[PDB]
Structure formats: C-alpha cells, structure tokens
Enzyme design. Structure first.
Site, PDB file in Angstrom:
ATOM      1  N   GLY B   8      55.814  33.570  14.834  1.00  0.00           N
ATOM      2  CA  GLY B   8      54.484  34.082  14.562  1.00  0.00           C
ATOM      3  C   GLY B   8      53.519  32.995  14.146  1.00  0.00           C
ATOM      4  O   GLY B   8      53.794  32.237  13.218  1.00  0.00           O
ATOM      5  N   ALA B   9      52.370  32.945  14.813  1.00  0.00           N
ATOM      6  CA  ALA B   9      51.363  31.938  14.520  1.00  0.00           C
ATOM      7  C   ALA B   9      50.165  32.565  13.831  1.00  0.00           C
ATOM      8  O   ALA B   9      49.020  32.360  14.241  1.00  0.00           O
ATOM      9  CB  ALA B   9      50.930  31.236  15.794  1.00  0.00           C
ATOM     10  N   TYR B  11      48.362  33.423   9.815  1.00  0.00           N
ATOM     11  CA  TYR B  11      47.925  32.523   8.757  1.00  0.00           C
ATOM     12  C   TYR B  11      49.120  31.750   8.181  1.00  0.00           C
ATOM     13  O   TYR B  11      49.126  30.513   8.162  1.00  0.00           O
ATOM     14  CB  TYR B  11      47.204  33.297   7.658  1.00  0.00           C
ATOM     15  CG  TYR B  11      45.815  33.766   8.035  1.00  0.00           C
ATOM     16  CD1 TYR B  11      45.620  34.966   8.703  1.00  0.00           C
ATOM     17  CD2 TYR B  11      44.698  33.009   7.717  1.00  0.00           C
ATOM     18  CE1 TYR B  11      44.344  35.402   9.042  1.00  0.00           C
ATOM     19  CE2 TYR B  11      43.423  33.429   8.056  1.00  0.00           C
ATOM     20  CZ  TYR B  11      43.250  34.626   8.717  1.00  0.00           C
ATOM     21  OH  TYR B  11      41.981  35.048   9.052  1.00  0.00           O
ATOM     22  N   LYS B  36      53.310  35.485  20.756  1.00  0.00           N
ATOM     23  CA  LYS B  36      53.212  36.378  21.906  1.00  0.00           C
ATOM     24  C   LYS B  36      51.943  36.104  22.704  1.00  0.00           C
ATOM     25  O   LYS B  36      51.845  36.462  23.875  1.00  0.00           O
ATOM     26  CB  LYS B  36      53.263  37.835  21.453  1.00  0.00           C
ATOM     27  CG  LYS B  36      51.981  38.363  20.836  1.00  0.00           C
ATOM     28  CD  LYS B  36      52.263  39.673  20.121  1.00  0.00           C
ATOM     29  CE  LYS B  36      52.500  40.804  21.109  1.00  0.00           C
ATOM     30  NZ  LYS B  36      53.112  41.995  20.453  1.00  0.00           N
ATOM     31  N   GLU B 167      34.888  47.670   5.422  1.00  0.00           N
ATOM     32  CA  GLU B 167      34.208  46.625   6.178  1.00  0.00           C
ATOM     33  C   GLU B 167      33.832  47.158   7.557  1.00  0.00           C
ATOM     34  O   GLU B 167      32.708  46.961   8.043  1.00  0.00           O
ATOM     35  CB  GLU B 167      35.088  45.380   6.305  1.00  0.00           C
ATOM     36  CG  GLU B 167      35.314  44.642   4.988  1.00  0.00           C
ATOM     37  CD  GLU B 167      35.660  43.172   5.182  1.00  0.00           C
ATOM     38  OE1 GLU B 167      36.778  42.869   5.652  1.00  0.00           O
ATOM     39  OE2 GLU B 167      34.814  42.316   4.856  1.00  0.00           O
ATOM     40  N   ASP B 297      52.215  38.461   5.568  1.00  0.00           N
ATOM     41  CA  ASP B 297      52.305  39.892   5.347  1.00  0.00           C
ATOM     42  C   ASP B 297      53.733  40.405   5.337  1.00  0.00           C
ATOM     43  O   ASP B 297      53.989  41.481   4.819  1.00  0.00           O
ATOM     44  CB  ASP B 297      51.495  40.639   6.403  1.00  0.00           C
ATOM     45  CG  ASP B 297      50.029  40.713   6.055  1.00  0.00           C
ATOM     46  OD1 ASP B 297      49.575  39.874   5.252  1.00  0.00           O
ATOM     47  OD2 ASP B 297      49.337  41.617   6.573  1.00  0.00           O
ATOM     48  N   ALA B 314      45.369  37.273   3.590  1.00  0.00           N
ATOM     49  CA  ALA B 314      45.380  35.984   4.267  1.00  0.00           C
ATOM     50  C   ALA B 314      45.458  34.809   3.296  1.00  0.00           C
ATOM     51  O   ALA B 314      46.101  33.800   3.582  1.00  0.00           O
ATOM     52  CB  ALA B 314      44.140  35.847   5.145  1.00  0.00           C
ATOM     53  N   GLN B 315      44.807  34.947   2.148  1.00  0.00           N
ATOM     54  CA  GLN B 315      44.761  33.877   1.161  1.00  0.00           C
ATOM     55  C   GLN B 315      46.168  33.488   0.692  1.00  0.00           C
ATOM     56  O   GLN B 315      46.597  32.313   0.780  1.00  0.00           O
ATOM     57  CB  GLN B 315      43.894  34.333  -0.008  1.00  0.00           C
ATOM     58  CG  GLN B 315      43.471  33.260  -0.980  1.00  0.00           C
ATOM     59  CD  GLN B 315      42.822  33.855  -2.215  1.00  0.00           C
ATOM     60  OE1 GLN B 315      42.721  33.208  -3.258  1.00  0.00           O
ATOM     61  NE2 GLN B 315      42.386  35.103  -2.104  1.00  0.00           N
TER      62      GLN B 315
END
Ligand SMILES: Cc1cc2nc3c(=O)[nH]c(=O)nc-3n(C[C@H](O)[C@H](O)[C@H](O)COP(=O)(O)OP(=O)(O)OC[C@H]3O[C@@H](n4cnc5c(N)ncnc54)[C@H](O)[C@@H]3O)c2cc1C
Ligand SMILES: Cc1cc2nc3c(=O)[nH]c(=O)nc-3n(C[C@H](O)[C@H](O)[C@H](O)COP(=O)(O)OP(=O)(O)OC[C@H]3O[C@@H](n4cnc5c(N)ncnc54)[C@H](O)[C@@H]3O)c2cc1C
Ligand SMILES: CCCCCCCc1cc(O)c2ccccc2[n+]1[O-]
Lengths: 394, 394
Positions: B8-9, B11, B36, B167, B297, B314-315
């Site tokens: 997985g690429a 964050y 992917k 958002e 995550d 993400a942080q």
C-alpha cells in the site's frame, strides 16, 4: 383584433412569429407564441452537446430576447390537445382561443414498436435530452475504472445511420480521447457502433459522399453494422439480427436516430396524418381548415417531380415560417395568399470538428471547406433571428 | 540481503518507503513497494472532486515520479492475502516473499451490516469512487429537467456527520449554484441531508467549533437529522428511524461516511484484529511478529495518558511511516529501536471552499484564516513527500 396562436417556438414557429412581428402594425392582431420552454434551441447542432464537444447553452437562446413584448405575447406552457370544432387549444395550465392557428410542434421519435427502444434508448431532440445523454455516457466511463471487466460501459450503440446518427458518431469519435484521459480509460476498449437496418449508410444519398464519410468515421474507429435491424433494446444493450440469427450487443448506452414522426398531438386532435405529418395545401394550410397553418416537421410536402416527400428539415421549416407569416398578414388584411414553393439549396453533414460532406448547387464538398460552410450556415440562421448581436454572443 | 515488502502506497506506506529510501544504502536491503494503482492520491482532499469543486487530477500524483528507481522496486498489483507461516504475500499477478513486512493498505468502508448500504451507497475513498459520485449526481440533475415531478433527483443523503461527511456536505453546498445553473434547476428544490445516528455531531471535538460549523452549513441550506439512524438503504433512497418509528427519504444519491474499518485483507490473513485493525506494540509491530509492521489506518493506537484510541488519520499515518522507517533502518544495521510517540498538532475542517474551522497546537481558528491554514497543511504534505517541485506542479 383577431387572434393568431403559434404552437411551438422551433424553426418554423420562431420564423413565423418574427415574420408576423416584422410585417404587421400594432393592434392589427393579437399574437400568442407558445413554448414548453422559455428558450428556443438550435436543433441542427444538438448532436454536439450530446457528445459534449460544445456546451448546451451555445445551442439555445431566450425567446423573450428575440421577440417584441408589445406585438407578441409569450406563453410558457405545454400543449395537451387541439379542439378544431371549438377552435380552442388546451394547455397544462389553461386554455386559448384562436381565429388563426399555426402548428409547429416539431417531431417526436418513431421507434416502430421495437421492444424497449422507447424505455431504454435516448433521443437527440432537446436540450434536456442531450444533457441527459452526455451525463449518462460520462457516468458510464466514470464507472469503468472501478469495474474493468465491464467493457459494455465503454460501448455506445447508435441506431440508424442517417444524417443525425452519422453526425453524432462523428462527434463522439472526436470526443473520445479527452473522455478517456479524464477517466483513466484505455482508448482501445471503447466501442462506437452505428447500426443500420437499411442496406446502405445514408440511404438515398450520393455514394461518393457516403463512402468518404464512412472512410473518415472508420478511420476514427467507428464501426458500421449494415443490413442489421435491432430486434430489441434492454438496459444491458441491444439485440440485433445478423445472417437471420439473433446476436447480442452489450452496451450501457443506446441512442436512437432511426426515425422521426410528426408530433402525436396533431394526430390525436383528429387531423388526417401520414407518419404524424400533414399533407398541407399549396398555402401550407391544413386540408379543410382555412384558419390552420402547419409548419416544419409537422407539415408534409411532396416533390411533384419524383412524387417523393421532402425530408423533415430545418431548412424547409424556415421557409414554411416565412410563407405562413406572409399569408397570415394577407389574410388579416383582406388580401390574397401566395402559394408556397420550396427552394432546397445545399446541405452539409458534419464528420467531427474539422470534417464534413455535402452537396451545394450540385457541387460536392469535402473537408475543411464543407466544415466552414456548415458553420457559416449556422451563423446565417443566428443572424436571421437575432441579428449581429446574437452571433456575437456565441 | 534482507527483503522488505511494503503493501500500500498511502500516507503510511509512502512515507515509510521514502524514509527507507533516505536512510539505507543501495545493497543494505531489497525494498518492494506494492500498489493497485500507479498513483498515490491525497485522501484528505477527496471530498472536493466528489462534489466537483476540484478536478480529481489535483488530488493524485504518480508514484514512479516520487521514488528512486534504483533503491525501491515498484510493483503495480492488488494484494490478495498474506501467509504468515510461509512469509509470503499472494497477489493477483504473482507472489512475493518477505523477511520484513510493512502493512499500510488503509481502510475500507464499514456498513455495520445495515441493509442495502453496501450495495446502494457510495464511499469517498479513491479517485475512481469520487469520479463515480460526481458523475452520478450530475446525471441525476440532468434527469430532473425532463421529469420535474421527481424531486428525489435533487435530494442527496449523506449518512454520518463525521469529519468527512461535514466537509463533503460543505463542498456540495458550495457546488450547488453552478450545478443548478447548468441543468435549469430551481435551487429551492434541492435538498442536501446529513444523517447522524448519534444525538451529537463530531464527538470529541470542541462543541463551539461544531455549533459554529453547523451554523455556517445550515446557512447554506444544509439539513441535519441527528439521533436518526439509517435502518436500511434502497436505490430509491433510505429508510431512517425517528422516535422509534420508520420514516422514508426518497433520494437518488446516498453517500456513506458513517464508518471505516481496517482493510479486510488483514483479518482474512489470520491476524488478530479489532475493528479490522491491529493493536500494535510500542514498535508498531504485530503482536507475535517481530518482522511485521502496521501503519496508517490499519494500525490502532491507544493514548496511554487517557486510555482512549487515536482516530485513524493521515497525520498519525505519516508519523507511523517515519517511525517504521527509522526502526527498520535500525533493525537491519543492528541498532536499538525507538518506541512510537504520536504528536497531534491539531486538524482543520473545511466548510466549503471559503470557510473552515480548526484547532492548531492550541489556537482555535475560524473562516478564511482556517481555510488558508488547511491549504498550508496540504502544502506541507506535498513538500514532505515530493519536494518543492510537487508543490510547484499544483
Ligand atoms: C442532430 C440533428 C441534426 C440536424 N441537422 C440538420 C441540418 O443540418 N440541416 C437541416 O435542414 N435540418 C437538420 N435537422 C432537422 C431540424 O433540426 C428539424 O427539421 C427542425 O427542428 C424542424 O423542426 P420544427 O421547426 O418543426 O420545430 P422543432 O425544432 O422540432 O421545435 C419544436 C418546438 O416546439 C416545442 N414543443 C414541442 N411540443 C410541444 C408541446 N406539446 N407544447 C409546447 N411546446 C412544444 C418544443 O419544445 C420545441 O421548442 C437536424 C436534427 C437533429 C436532431
Ligand atoms: C474527506 C476525507 C478527509 C480527511 N481529512 C483528514 C485531515 O484533515 N487530517 C487527518 O489527519 N486525516 C484526514 N483524513 C483521513 C486520511 O485521509 C486517512 O486516514 C489516510 O489516508 C491514512 O490512511 P493510509 O495512509 O493508511 O491509507 P490510504 O491513504 O487510505 O490508502 C492506502 C493505499 O494503499 C492502496 N491500496 C489499498 N488496498 C490495496 C490493495 N489490496 N492492493 C494494493 N493497493 C491497495 C490504496 O489504493 C492506497 O493508495 C481524511 C479522510 C477523508 C476520506
Ligand atoms: C450560406 C450559403 C449556403 C446556403 C445553404 C443554406 C441551406 C441550409 C442548409 C441547412 O442544412 C440549414 C440548416 C438549418 C437552418 C438553415 C439551413 N439552410 O438554410
């Protein structure tokens, strides 16, 4: 003051109305112009927004801008029926009475009773319809990336290889690279298929033009299936007949350009009609009615030379409008009417943004020349109805 | 030479890979990066293309551009399963073996078994998904003009009043004027509905900021239904529970921002998981596996001071990546690892393009200031992974 009622603000209706506004003085008559939309759209270019090569706003104009509020009263409503005996026109929100009536409600699609064609196929006949087509196709291409086995998302079937179908598949063909780039789609997977029940593409047209158009379109990957009728239409695709055997095409999008008929309201109102069209008298009046005029696609004109009908076109529709305007003015002032004679000049079919085929004055035209000629004609109609300002607006 | 495989690429994955890139020499280890897609997308801004306020290309970047072709080998494939015993990772197009493994496959939607929610609702979790959502909404608005009785076309139901939902509805609210202009729609008929099962919006956030956000969004016509759970989801709309009695909302579009879980691959591979996530040791390793690291995550972190979990963000994912990079570099070279300590400096939530709310470090912010702050954070991540050039490209 006598009452003139015009149903539909298409080519015939708008030209008739503008003609009447130009020819008549104040209170000579009460003119009511009826449209289901507050805008008039350029039908002859509707194929471009359907493909997405042009914004739809460039294919329509506000009616109130064109007309005179004093001379002509504009009503935005939908015609339901016409009562010839009462000389009354029924609407979704009211009713009207006419001393004179001009009918220009244009054409509606003819699906020939083919199964599912009405429910699951699209038509290029309005701003709404083409916006729906465009957004539909974009939706399918959007769905493809997440679900790559479904190449039926990338397959678009256009039924009928007539004038409209050819122009449309040309526009689609031009639109495909940007569309593929937008949704990460392999351009090779995209299928644009034109299906014709008739044995020849552009039947009843000069074979040189047909072959040229077919070469150009084929170069851009458009596939033609000829002598192939569509047995039925489903959301998954269409079922066609090949070599007397049923075959299936899986396509998320099916657009019907197979045939058109006159508006069903006319036939439903008791007029005697062929293909929904009325074979009018030399004065473009409905047979039996001295006060009812038929224009555009609703009116049927026969060519005395070959005993074959004139195709339903905007070119002849405009002429219907001018003739009816003059005859109405004469009738209003006690005068004699002038018989309508159609003068059919050049005709051009687009093949993408930069190519076209057509016959003007007997002279065949190709490529950039024909393309510019078509653009020129469009500008001419825009000038004719809106002046230089309208041409400037676009 | 030991083999490190990164799945997985996102964050966590991207930051881990870049860290390993900086820290290790050309033959210290063999590093394989698996994705992917050939691009890495900015998840934290995916709400903007979903509404159509921003082009999706501005939310993604090419992976091959960011990394070093010599140091790290990039494989474009989809992970299927991990065999802990054989130390092998199975793929759609091959298989790989790892001495060390870094798992950062992110989250997948969690529908909690609510009926029809998986099948008939949309998620904001990729470029493909947001393109699908936007084109879907545009399609419904395109369909409305032809069928003005179908107001459900103009109704969008957003399930869950979390960060993403808020958002998103903000972006939708800003997007509505141009959208309505495009499809001849009366803006009053449009309904944007945010549905929350919980009695209060954004738990664990400063109530002042929450009330302010709700005030601002409510000003834009956004509807909030709180303490209202979604009993079931259908293509026609959703069925919700009000006062213990069923109620129906007819909506052509339903978007789910209700909950997320760790990637199902982790659970299916035999790992011990809570909510699809792994409760890792201070070294971000899987309990029982000294050679497997979990980031972003997929990893679950508990705050030792107050014993409450850190939300999947993400942080903290970026911080996971850097920590894992450092610890792997230490492990290969025979050093001591440093336990992970999370430093949360605050987060800002957009309320459309021109409004935002947030707490940074300790200072509460509102309006244009907070909006500019969010843009700045975006710039920070862009610089951190791509350098000045990445920031320059956008
Ligand atoms: C892609 C396409 C390309 C074409 N290219 C050419 C070309 O190059 N050259 C050429 O000569 N012809 C061309 N045509 C044909 C030309 O557009 C039509 O012949 C033209 O529209 C003539 O129709 P009309 O004037 O009778 O009115 P229409 O254009 O059909 O308009 C009818 C009007 O009446 C309204 N209306 C319909 N029903 C109702 C109702 N119940 N109540 C209220 N309002 C109603 C409609 O909203 C519409 O505004 C093309 C057609 C298409 C689809
Ligand atoms: C609208 C929205 C707004 C957000 N705003 C914030 C914010 O303001 N501040 C904050 O801290 N957090 C925010 N977040 C959360 C943040 O985006 C995620 O938590 C973040 O992506 C961390 O997850 P990740 O890096 O582990 O994996 P992800 O970024 O989710 O993705 C993992 C990568 O692995 C790929 N992948 C997934 N499965 C496979 C597979 N089987 N095979 C191969 N590749 C795969 C994916 O394509 C993806 O590129 C927001 C999230 C959303 C949806
Ligand atoms: C400008 C010299 C060319 C003259 C040819 C015009 C014939 C012509 C041909 C069309 O295809 C039309 C389509 C829509 C409206 C008008 C049209 N006219 O006027």
């Amino acid at each position: 003051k006598p009452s003139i009622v015009i149903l539909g603000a298409g080519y015939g209706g708008i030209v008739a109305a503008l003609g009447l506004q130009k020819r008549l003085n104040y209170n000579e008559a009460d003119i009511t112009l009826v449209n289901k939309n507050d805008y008039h759209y350029i039908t002859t270019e509707l194929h471009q927004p359907a493909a997405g090569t042009m914004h739809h706003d460039q294919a329509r104009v506000g009616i109130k801008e064109l007309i005179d509020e004093k001379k002509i009263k504009f009503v935005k409503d939908t015609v339901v029926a016409i009562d010839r005996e009462q000389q009354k026109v029924t609407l979704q929100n009211g009713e009207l009475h006419y001393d004179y009536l001009v009918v220009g409600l244009g054409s509606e699609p003819e699906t020939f009773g083919i199964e599912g064609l009405r429910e699951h196929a699209f038509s290029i006949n309005s701003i709404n319809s083409v916006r729906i087509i465009r957004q539909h196709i974009e939706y399918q291409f959007a769905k493809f990336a997440a679900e790559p086995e479904r190449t039926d998302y990338l397959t678009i079937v256009v039924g009928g290889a007539g004038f409209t179908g050819i122009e449309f598949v040309g526009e689609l063909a031009d639109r495909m690279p940007e569309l593929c780039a937008e949704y990460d789609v392999d351009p090779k997977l995209v299928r644009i298929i034109n299906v014709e029940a008739a044995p020849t593409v552009l039947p009843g047209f000069d074979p040189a033009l047909v072959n040229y158009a077919m070469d150009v379109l084929g170069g851009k990957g458009v596939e033609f299936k000829i002598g192939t009728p569509i047995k039925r239409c489903t959301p998954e695709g269409v079922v066609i007949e090949v070599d007397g055997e049923e075959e299936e095409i899986k396509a998320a999008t099916v657009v019907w350009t197979g045939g058109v008929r006159g508006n069903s309201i006319v036939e439903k109102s008791g007029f005697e009609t062929m293909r929904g069209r009325i074979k009018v008298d030399p004065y473009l009046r409905a047979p039996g009615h001295e006060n009812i005029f038929i224009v555009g696609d609703c009116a049927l004109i026969i060519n005395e030379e070959n005993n074959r009908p004139y195709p339903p076109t905007a070119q002849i529709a405009i002429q219907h409008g001018e003739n009816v305007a003059a005859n109405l003015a004469a009738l209003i002032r006690g005068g004699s009417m002038t018989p309508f004679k159609p003068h059919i000049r050049g005709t051009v079919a687009s093949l993408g943004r930069n190519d076209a085929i057509g016959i003007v004055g007997g002279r065949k035209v190709y490529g950039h020349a024909a393309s510019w000629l078509k653009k020129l004609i469009d500008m001419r109609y825009l000038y004719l109805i809106g002046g230089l300002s309208l041409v400037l607006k676009k």
